[PDB]
Amino acid sequence: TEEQIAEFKEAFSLFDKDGDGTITTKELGTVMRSLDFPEFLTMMARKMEEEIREAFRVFDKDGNGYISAAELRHVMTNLGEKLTDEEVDEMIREADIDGDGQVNYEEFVQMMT
Amino acid sequence: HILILQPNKTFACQMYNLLLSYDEHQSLELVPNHQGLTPFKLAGVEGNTVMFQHLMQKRKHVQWTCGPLTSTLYDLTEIDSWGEELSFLELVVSSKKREARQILEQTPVKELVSFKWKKYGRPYFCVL
Amino acid sequence: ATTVMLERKMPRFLWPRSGICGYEYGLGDRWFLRVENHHDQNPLRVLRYVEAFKHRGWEILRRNT
Amino acid sequence: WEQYRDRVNMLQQERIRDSPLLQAAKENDLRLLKILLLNQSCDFQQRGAVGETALHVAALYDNLEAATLLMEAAPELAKEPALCEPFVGQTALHIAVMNQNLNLVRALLARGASVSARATGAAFRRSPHNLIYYGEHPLSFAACVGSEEIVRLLIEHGADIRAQDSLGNTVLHILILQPNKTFACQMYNLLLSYDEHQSLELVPNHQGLTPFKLAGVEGNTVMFQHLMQKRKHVQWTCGPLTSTLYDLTEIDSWGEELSFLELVVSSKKREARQILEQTPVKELVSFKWKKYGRPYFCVLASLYILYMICFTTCCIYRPLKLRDDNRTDPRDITILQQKLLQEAYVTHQDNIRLVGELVTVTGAVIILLLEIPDIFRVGASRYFGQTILGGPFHVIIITYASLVLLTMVMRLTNMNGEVVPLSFALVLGWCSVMYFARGFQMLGPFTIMIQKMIFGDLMRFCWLMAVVILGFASAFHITFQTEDPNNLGEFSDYPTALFSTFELFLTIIDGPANYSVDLPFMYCITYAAFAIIATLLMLNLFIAMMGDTHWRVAQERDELWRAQVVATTVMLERKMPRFLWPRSGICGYEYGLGDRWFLRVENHHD
Amino acid sequence: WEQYRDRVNMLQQERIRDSPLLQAAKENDLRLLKILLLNQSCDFQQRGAVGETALHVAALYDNLEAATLLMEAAPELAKEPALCEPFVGQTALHIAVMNQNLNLVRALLARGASVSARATGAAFRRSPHNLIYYGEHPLSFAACVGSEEIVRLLIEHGADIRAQDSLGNTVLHILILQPNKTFACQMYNLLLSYDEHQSLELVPNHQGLTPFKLAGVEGNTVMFQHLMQKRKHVQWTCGPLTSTLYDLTEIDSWGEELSFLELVVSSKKREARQILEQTPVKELVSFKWKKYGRPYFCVLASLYILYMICFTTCCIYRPLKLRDDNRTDPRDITILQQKLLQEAYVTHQDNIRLVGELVTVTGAVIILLLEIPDIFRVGASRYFGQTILGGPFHVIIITYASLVLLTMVMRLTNMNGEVVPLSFALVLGWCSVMYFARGFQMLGPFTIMIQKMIFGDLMRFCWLMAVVILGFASAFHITFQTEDPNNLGEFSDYPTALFSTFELFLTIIDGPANYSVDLPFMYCITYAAFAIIATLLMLNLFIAMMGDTHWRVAQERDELWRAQVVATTVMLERKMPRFLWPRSGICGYEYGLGDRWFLRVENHHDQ
Ligand SMILES: [Ca+2]
Ligand SMILES: [Ca+2]
Ligand SMILES: [Ca+2]
């Protein structure tokens, strides 16, 4: 849930252009040509494992809901197997589907299953 | 202060912004502790960067969008504290906790101190 | 840390204090920093949300779980 | 610069804060805007105070209704670019193209704003200060934003595809200079279809670069092979396999002065080394090196070795003489002396030594006569930095040739001290061979590994070495400046003391002691401290850091060597005459195709 | 060659372009084809310049209706093979098979073309020039492309399975010689079912290779275990476990000279080296090593260890003599002298060292007699190839035996310089122990890592060495020639200075220095430059490159050492007399099974 609303937090920030905390039709209109947050949280609420949730929480160091490459390398060095840094980026290229340089819970669970 | 002292949650940050909304009034944010610490400086020395950037959210002001690129400005008022004896920055970099070194990588401060280095600090350091 | 040390200890005559004097611009006694960014426009992050508005290390990581 | 740019941007925000007409425009307070438009005394020729217009403001803030209310009273501002200094040709058409609002663009064209109005501002420039380069004409903006229907409308209302820019750029060029999208390939094929017809691909830039060569130097390899697909000709399939062929006409450019290949291999951008992995050029360079280049390189290196050994045995039998004078001095041993030139040239042995020396100098002069006009063609700073081209190997050989020229002049003037430049040029000519050590497969990547490594962290070891030995050598000279030098040695004065410490840091010479005689009290402590701090401490760290660095660059050095061998190939095919180099290709004029060379290739599919 | 293929392909394509009948054929210009067929005077037996049918062109480009019109006009073109140099027997049948147009194949057989035609052209050859080899037959092509119904129709219209190509290719053999497809197993099973009869699998090629031996030397282990599935025989299951038995008759290769397992280990391909991991063979070699191979190896190793010591102590007591003359010279130390033969052998101790020498030479001659006839049987260049065999180990023991044979003659001729072959033979013969390191478990892969590494990167270091050390040696001789050689040392002339640079390069000798006398002013800079390029720079880089290649190589040597021991095992058991090697297997002839040897094996597993 907390990583889930972390997805909608940055999403709402992507909708909110002026950053006033609302989404107007003009902000919605600029989206269509390219094709509140509790209001946005309530609206997306009707639209929507334990160990995996436990696995992600020890992995994401800052708890932003998004594992970076340096967090992964720090885990990979904590794993104890030697790897260079280029294939770690390929691991991000393997998992980051929408291309934000990040992985959420949903990109993580499609990788594990 | 105790909302800062927490395993960091945006879940808790909703309660933070909630209680900030229930602030119905001098400015309540300007309170120091017995140690003399504003919650801004407490979050800075704690380095909860999610809480820090949410604290930075109302500090922003955008200026204009222009297709795929957008300009804005930040207020660097509370980040300097040159009038104080205790600077914010030395308070950050002098800490027992490790992960405070991560808050150096924030989008207001990084290019700022880099600019202030590369204009000033490197020639003085070399000639010294 | 080295920077803020020497900038605490050296005298102020060599250094104008950085920032943007908004008092010149009528903002008044508060200094600012302008910055811009160019972002990418990934469509896939937008599509599903507006639509709602309408290999060595990977194996071992599976073994670690 | 950047600071000036942000300052004038903030001043622009001040001026947009100033006038309530423009402020209500950017706020879209259309009730008050009806009052302002009802006002006759509200001047509508009022422009933005730092070089903009009100329609530019409404285009920025996308307030198209306010723009419509503006266009009745002043439609002429729709045709006006304003006079800002970085923004000197900019019209609202560019902003409307950028923000993809087709109704706004259509309303601007309803007033008939000229598409052929071109915008070349100071910020409108390829710059490291500029974050985004999008070209000059509004067609370039429509292309890079990728709006199909807008550029269709521009075609419908003018907007010539043949568009000439500052720096001679065309739409093709800015499509190449782009962060890559598959959508850009579709836009490219679209405008290629909407081209009517010489051909438009034939034009170069102001620098004289075709977009084929621009795509080659920039390595957008999806766009590259997709552009190759139009020239691809398949011949026949059967079963699992498929025989096809390519027209290698534009890829050679042997008739041109600057070939495609020397253009690609000489570039400061890295990713172009990837573009040689495309199939027809890979087969071409493989065939071309395998048929000729390796035997020519072997025989050239063999003749160079044969030159060097004759130079060496010339350097052996220098003419010498007994020392004439008496030393009158202990700690003085100098029993030899130079001969005179009249004294030297006396024997048949001197005659054969002289003809060997003649061989050396006539091999010396041809190096200059070979490579000196090559240096003026390219930038010398560009020439020396390219390790793929062997610039640092060119550094050694010119100094070698200069010193071997200089030493004969030193001889002919009866000048002493020729042994020192001879000693220099000798070891420089011997270390010169590592350029020719490239050609073997087993030998190849190793030398560019060590060439990377000597620039890599050797200085990091060296500077620390110098300062720590500058400490300890002075300490040792102070602690041995009181007693008998006949027993201690190495520490008479400071310059022999520092060199003693340099010898004894590397463990080459054993530690100094005499166990018959007595020794001072401090030196035990100081020498033990030096031994623990220097010998095993960070020498081992050098080993560990060395191993980690080799471990990381172990992937990349082979990728470098593959480019290095074809760089060598195109160099030697440049400088050798053409009767040794027949045409690689298939003369289709034999087969009625006419004046073109092709390449047939096949495989089964996977 | 390969270049000639380009010219003939493009010229053939030009002649395709030339004939407008062939243009309308390749382009299916069926209106214009009816126009050309309306012409009676048009020759319809036109052939290309390399020699082709228009039906071959239409089959290439699948214009099947035009092919029907042509066979309606002239069916006799359907029975014509190609007259090309690369394609000496090519028909449209093979083309229609490989391009899989079953109705067109049915139209070809409707005209009744002979299935058994032989397309044996130059491009129909197992070659590195050729991309994919299959053999000749249309049956082979239908099998390798995997179409059932085509080869079913071929069986329905004759097309005998029992056939042979050049080099003895039969259908099963070329099915083995394929990249791995799941369909190959199915087609193999299908043709095996369709065989109805000695068996057809019993025939070898021209080379003498049964297809089981071909699958062994290739190692397609899925096909191997699927073939082995027929050789399996379960005995009983109970609970979670199952006892079964295997027929090891086929895997034995008993009466043949060509043994199966040595043929497996004598291969260039690495993947067939994998086939040792199969379930019968691993158990068999483990049992056979454990019961016999290790102690038989250890006793022979002990005997060779004892053999070396007698030669050692023989080399100790050479006959010596006090030097007769007077050297009368400084830098001249020749105080001993070689002793004459008739002067030597006079004591009881002389008899001792004489019979001790006799032991060594009679060991050496039987080392020769054991070694020689192995060479002519196998490929000699192959014999020095495989390190599994230890070819370069065999080279040095051959040379050792040669030198210890040679050194007798110089005594027999009383030739001076007797130490000169002897020291070389001594130091080479002590290196004859490294083959025995593979017998020990902890010692095995270590020496093969060494043997990999000495060919691996040692030459990369060695070729870099000589140039830089030669240049510095030249610089040192043309900086020390100015000076009295008695006070400097190490640099009297050019060869000793050349050797001295090799000495103090690898830090064997401490750097030259003098205290009482001063030094040349130029020497300091030169020697410092040599020291900084020399020691810490490139030697340490060799250390790092060694460490980097160690980890990258270190996996494969384990499987390689496990591969070595079975070749050692079969070579050990082959040359011994027969009574020391009993029959492995289970004689079921006692048990009513009859003249076959089996192997019981069981496995607990999960269900
Ligand atoms: Ca909003
Ligand atoms: Ca994170
Ligand atoms: Ca993602």
Residue numbers in the entry:
A (entry chain E): 6 to 40, 65 to 77, 83 to 147
B (entry chain A): 201 to 225, 230 to 332
C (entry chain A): 599 to 652, 699 to 709
D (entry chain C): 29 to 225, 230 to 638
E (entry chain D): 29 to 225, 230 to 639
Tell me, in the authors' exact words, what the paper reports.
TRPV5 is a calcium selective channel that displays constitutive activity in the presence of basal levels of the membrane phospholipid phosphatidylinositol 4,5-bisphosphate (PI(4,5)P2). The TRPV5 channel is tetrameric and consists of classic TRPV family features, including six transmembrane helices (S1–S6), N-terminal ankyrin repeats (ARD), and the TRP domain4. Two endogenous mechanisms of regulation, binding of PI(4,5)P2 or CaM to TRPV5, result in activation or inactivation of the channel, respectively. Here we have presented three structures of TRPV5, one in the presence of endogenous lipids that are likely to be involved in maintaining the structure of TRPV5, one bound to its endogenous activator, PI(4,5)P2, and one bound to its endogenous inhibitor, CaM.
In order to investigate the mechanism of TRPV5 inactivation by CaM, we incubated detergent solubilized full-length rabbit TRPV5 with calcium-activated rat CaM in a 1:20 molar ratio in the presence of 10 mM CaCl2. The stoichiometry of TRPV5 to CaM has been speculated to be between one and four molecules of CaM per tetramer and the affinity between CaM and the TRPV5 C-terminus estimated at ~0.3 µM24, therefore the high molar ratio was used to ensure TRPV5 saturation with CaM. This sample yielded a cryo-EM map at 4.4 Å without applied symmetry. In this structure, a single CaM molecule is bound to the intracellular section of TRPV5 at the base of the pore. CaM is bound with the C-lobe at the base of the pore and the N-lobe resting against the ankyrin repeats of two adjacent TRPV5 monomers. An extension of the TRPV5 chain A C-terminus (Asn640-Lys652) forms a helix and is bound to the hydrophobic binding pocket of the CaM N-lobe. This interaction is mediated by numerous hydrophobic contacts: Val644, Leu645, Val648, and Phe651 on the TRPV5 side and Phe20, Leu33, Val36, and Leu64 on the CaM side. A loop of the CaM C-lobe (Gly114-Thr118) crosses over the bottom of the TRPV5 pore, placing Lys116 directly into the pore. The ε-amino group of Lys116 sits in between the four Trp583 residues of the lower gate, forming a cation–π interaction and thereby blocking the flow of ions through the pore. On the other hand, the Trp583 to Leu mutant of TRPV5 was essentially not inhibited by Ca2+-CaM. Despite the interaction with CaM, the CaM-bound conformation of TRPV5 is almost identical to the lipid-bound conformation of TRPV5, with an RMSD of ~0.6 A overall and a very similar pore profile.
